[PDB]
Scaffold this active site. Structure first.
Site, short mmCIF file in Angstrom:
data_model
loop_
_atom_site.label_atom_id
_atom_site.label_comp_id
_atom_site.label_asym_id
_atom_site.label_seq_id
_atom_site.Cartn_x
_atom_site.Cartn_y
_atom_site.Cartn_z
N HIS A 135 -0.10 10.18 -0.38
CA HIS A 135 0.07 9.11 0.64
C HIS A 135 1.38 9.32 1.41
O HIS A 135 1.46 8.94 2.58
CB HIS A 135 -0.07 7.70 -0.01
CG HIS A 135 0.82 7.38 -1.17
ND1 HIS A 135 0.34 7.39 -2.49
CD2 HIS A 135 2.11 6.96 -1.24
CE1 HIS A 135 1.32 7.03 -3.31
NE2 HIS A 135 2.40 6.75 -2.56
N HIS A 154 11.10 8.02 0.35
CA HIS A 154 9.88 8.58 0.95
C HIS A 154 9.78 8.26 2.45
O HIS A 154 10.66 7.60 3.03
CB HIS A 154 8.69 8.09 0.15
CG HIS A 154 8.66 6.62 0.22
ND1 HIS A 154 9.05 5.85 -0.84
CD2 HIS A 154 8.33 5.82 1.24
CE1 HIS A 154 8.97 4.59 -0.49
NE2 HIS A 154 8.52 4.53 0.79
N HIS A 165 7.35 7.87 6.17
CA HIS A 165 6.17 7.44 6.94
C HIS A 165 6.29 8.04 8.32
O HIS A 165 7.40 7.91 8.91
CB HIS A 165 6.13 5.92 6.98
CG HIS A 165 6.19 5.32 5.62
ND1 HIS A 165 5.05 4.99 4.89
CD2 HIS A 165 7.25 4.94 4.87
CE1 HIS A 165 5.40 4.51 3.71
NE2 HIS A 165 6.76 4.39 3.71
N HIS A 221 12.44 5.60 3.65
CA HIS A 221 12.72 4.43 2.79
C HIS A 221 13.46 4.90 1.56
O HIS A 221 12.86 5.65 0.80
CB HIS A 221 11.43 3.70 2.42
CG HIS A 221 10.84 2.97 3.57
ND1 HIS A 221 9.52 2.56 3.60
CD2 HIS A 221 11.40 2.51 4.71
CE1 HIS A 221 9.29 1.89 4.71
NE2 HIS A 221 10.44 1.82 5.42
N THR A 270 5.59 -1.85 0.97
CA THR A 270 4.64 -1.68 2.08
C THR A 270 3.39 -0.94 1.60
O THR A 270 2.56 -0.62 2.45
CB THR A 270 5.31 -0.95 3.26
OG1 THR A 270 5.61 0.39 2.85
CG2 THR A 270 6.55 -1.64 3.76
N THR A 271 3.30 -0.62 0.32
CA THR A 271 2.07 -0.08 -0.29
C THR A 271 1.67 -0.97 -1.47
O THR A 271 2.51 -1.66 -2.06
CB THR A 271 2.27 1.37 -0.74
OG1 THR A 271 3.39 1.37 -1.62
CG2 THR A 271 2.51 2.32 0.40
N1 TKQ Z 1 7.17 1.92 1.23
S1 TKQ Z 1 8.17 0.99 0.35
O1 TKQ Z 1 9.52 1.49 0.48
O2 TKQ Z 1 7.91 -0.36 0.71
C1 TKQ Z 1 7.71 1.19 -1.35
C2 TKQ Z 1 6.37 1.08 -1.68
C3 TKQ Z 1 5.98 1.24 -3.00
C4 TKQ Z 1 6.90 1.51 -4.00
C5 TKQ Z 1 6.45 1.41 -5.45
C6 TKQ Z 1 7.51 1.58 -6.51
N2 TKQ Z 1 7.54 2.97 -6.93
C7 TKQ Z 1 8.56 3.49 -7.61
O3 TKQ Z 1 9.68 3.70 -7.11
N3 TKQ Z 1 8.22 3.61 -8.93
C8 TKQ Z 1 8.75 4.37 -9.99
C9 TKQ Z 1 8.10 4.09 -11.19
C10 TKQ Z 1 8.73 4.36 -12.40
C11 TKQ Z 1 9.98 4.93 -12.40
I1 TKQ Z 1 11.10 4.89 -14.17
C12 TKQ Z 1 10.57 5.36 -11.21
C13 TKQ Z 1 9.94 5.08 -10.01
C14 TKQ Z 1 8.24 1.67 -3.64
C15 TKQ Z 1 8.65 1.48 -2.32
ZN ZN Z 2 7.99 3.22 2.22
#
Ligand code: TKQ
Ligand code: ZN
Ligand code: TKQ
Ligand code: NAG
Ligand code: NAG
Ligand code: NAG
Ligand code: NAG
Ligand code: NAG
Ligand code: ZN
Lengths: 277, 277
Positions: free
Chosen positions: A65, A94, A96, A119, A208-209
């Site tokens: 994605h 990440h 977009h 982001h 935003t996801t």
């Molecule tokens: N596009 S946005 O910026 O709005 C956005 C969308 C979705 C996400 C989801 C969170 N993901 C994440 O960082 N999980 C992760 C899980 C476990 C470990 I330990 C380390 C990392 C983040 C930001």
């Molecule tokens: Zn994002």
């Protein structure tokens, strides 16, 4: 099962497939409207800073994605208060972008889309000892939005890709989901120096996801960092995951959400910051 | 008499026609070299601030070599130390640009030329009571260099021309020297918020036009503000003065000088600032 370009799993279906919380009324992204926002002079310059004695490697993944940089624990931090005491810990960055140079960003500024929005995702280490503890909890996350704009004339060294060390040349058509690759570390302090870190929008919103969790403190810098057309095309060579209809990764942004949909039970305000000047 | 484009009176001759001080060894502009320069962490964020009780009008003149904005007395200030106590008072702002998009700036950054460089000129009011007392005296002046870069996709409100209020439309073929016009005030605080005011080169140098006086504290911001092709071509519509060989104003920049010519009796150092990291 979610996607950007498969109308079965696409952004119009998230409110139905992930009601907690993609059906909420504190959603992101929003149109950042300079005229309707409230200037808050107490909002201070953002600082990003590194733990000198951190050693561990950074990676990047094609997650199907987006392109996601995964930072090692305890190494990159944000300060909103001028104190370097590890209140916010960076987890990932990440991107977009668009199929074309006139779109790509999640946020708009007075209705204008940028070709690329980065982001920088952090968790509130002040309260929560781990990202997995913070990601699902109230007030867990703080994201910085970095707009990128295309220029025809620039030295490599003055582009955002210098701060990214060109993603160590990892971006190509064979960088397939869910592959990761180790990369040279991202100089996030240099990235922030490429814009004005005093000049930003601020509001409470969401991921935003899916599941669009309403636990994000948003900061979106008004001034863009600069890239070249060749650099944006490096992202567009990435392939989408197989749950997508489009083959090449692009148009990986959520549609614009209202600041205050009609069913809100407590309106939110969009704030803006500028320098002690 | 001097010019940019008449080989009889042009920049290669200034050292002979104005030896005080165009024959000096602390001349500007220079190549601003990131690698060679000394990072000095004591150099603070630049602030530009206005006397909100000031009422006087600003004017712009085609002086035959540039477009020069003349600010009223006691109105716009610079602080280099975070105190708003009127140490540096802004006098004027003028511009250098190219016949083409790949040149125009007086300074270079690692050999790169920008299409347009603005010069915010101030006097050391801390020491000198008036601009005419400071302009010819030691340590009298401080100039801010603002690089501009062309982008294809941008809203007017995020371009430098929003800060300039389009110079009230005065940039056109009929703005002949030495005509002067009243213009809307320039929002120099907004202009400075379009780049990173902590990220700059700093050195001691000179005026870039005869008599090249060596009394200028230089600050050149590394990040450019953004403009359009349409906006740069407005400057190119101005006519040159009758001392010039070229009809249309353009290439009104001085060639690059060395930081330390071979005949120097006391080398200078190029400094660099960056944000409280
Ligand atoms: N596009 S946005 O910026 O709005 C956005 C969308 C979705 C996400 C989801 C969170 N993901 C994440 O960082 N999980 C992760 C899980 C476990 C470990 I330990 C380390 C990392 C983040 C930001
Ligand atoms: Zn994002
Ligand atoms: N290119 S540069 O930035 O190195 C540069 C070159 C030459 C000068 C000219 C100095 N004169 C002046 O400031 N004008 C003036 C206007 C109103 C009053 I009241 C007093 C004086 C300034 C800067
Ligand atoms: C100072 C800080 O916040 N975190 C870490 C420290 O805890 C860790 O043991 C060290 C080696 O990885 O790097 C830094
Ligand atoms: C973060 C992550 O999932 N990293 C993987 C790693 O576990 C795997 O063994 C390696 C070999 O293909 O590539 C990558
Ligand atoms: C120079 C300064 O610091 N403040 C001035 C003040 O002297 C002046 O009387 C007032 C009205 O024009 O504008 C402001
Ligand atoms: C789109 C653009 O570049 N500039 C617009 C111009 O078209 C418009 O007519 C006017 C609105 O008052 O100013 C602004
Ligand atoms: C305050 C003012 O004069 N603004 C105008 C703007 O509305 C116009 O869109 C732009 C380009 O035509 O030039 C400027
Ligand atoms: Zn000048």
């Amino acid at each position: 099962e979610w996607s950007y370009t498969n109308i079965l799993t696409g952004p119009e279906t998230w409110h139905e497939h992930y009601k907690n919380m993609c059906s909420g009324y504190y959603q992101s992204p929003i149109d950042l409207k300079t005229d309707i926002s409230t200037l808050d002079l107490k909002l201070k310059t953002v600082i990003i800073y590194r733990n000198t004695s951190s050693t561990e490697t950074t990676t990047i993944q094609n997650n199907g994605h987006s392109a996601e940089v995964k930072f090692p624990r305890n190494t990159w931090f944000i300060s909103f208060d001028g104190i370097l005491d590890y209140k916010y810990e960076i987890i990932q960055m990440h991107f977009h972008w668009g199929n074309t140079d006139d779109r790509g960003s999640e946020h708009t500024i007075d209705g204008f889309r940028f070709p690329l929005e980065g982001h920088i995702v952090s968790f509130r280490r002040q309260m929560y000892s781990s990202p997995s503890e913070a990601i699902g909890r109230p007030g867990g996350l703080a994201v910085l939005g970095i707009m990128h704009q295309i220029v025809e004339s620039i030295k490599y060294e003055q582009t955002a890709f210098k701060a990214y060390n060109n993603f160590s040349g990892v971006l190509n058509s064979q960088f397939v989901p869910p592959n990761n690759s180790t990369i040279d570390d991202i100089n996030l302090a240099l990235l922030l120096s490429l814009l004005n870190p005093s000049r930003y929008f601020r509001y409470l919103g969401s991921l935003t996801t899916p599941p669009c969790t309403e636990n994000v403190l948003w900061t979106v810098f008004i001034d863009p960092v600069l890239i070249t057309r060749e650099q944006i095309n490096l992202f567009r060579n990435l392939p989408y995951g197989s749950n997508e209809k489009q083959t090449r990764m692009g148009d990986n942004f959520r549609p614009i959400q209202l600041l205050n949909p009609i069913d809100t039970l407590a309106s939110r305000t969009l704030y803006r910051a500028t320098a002690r000047g």
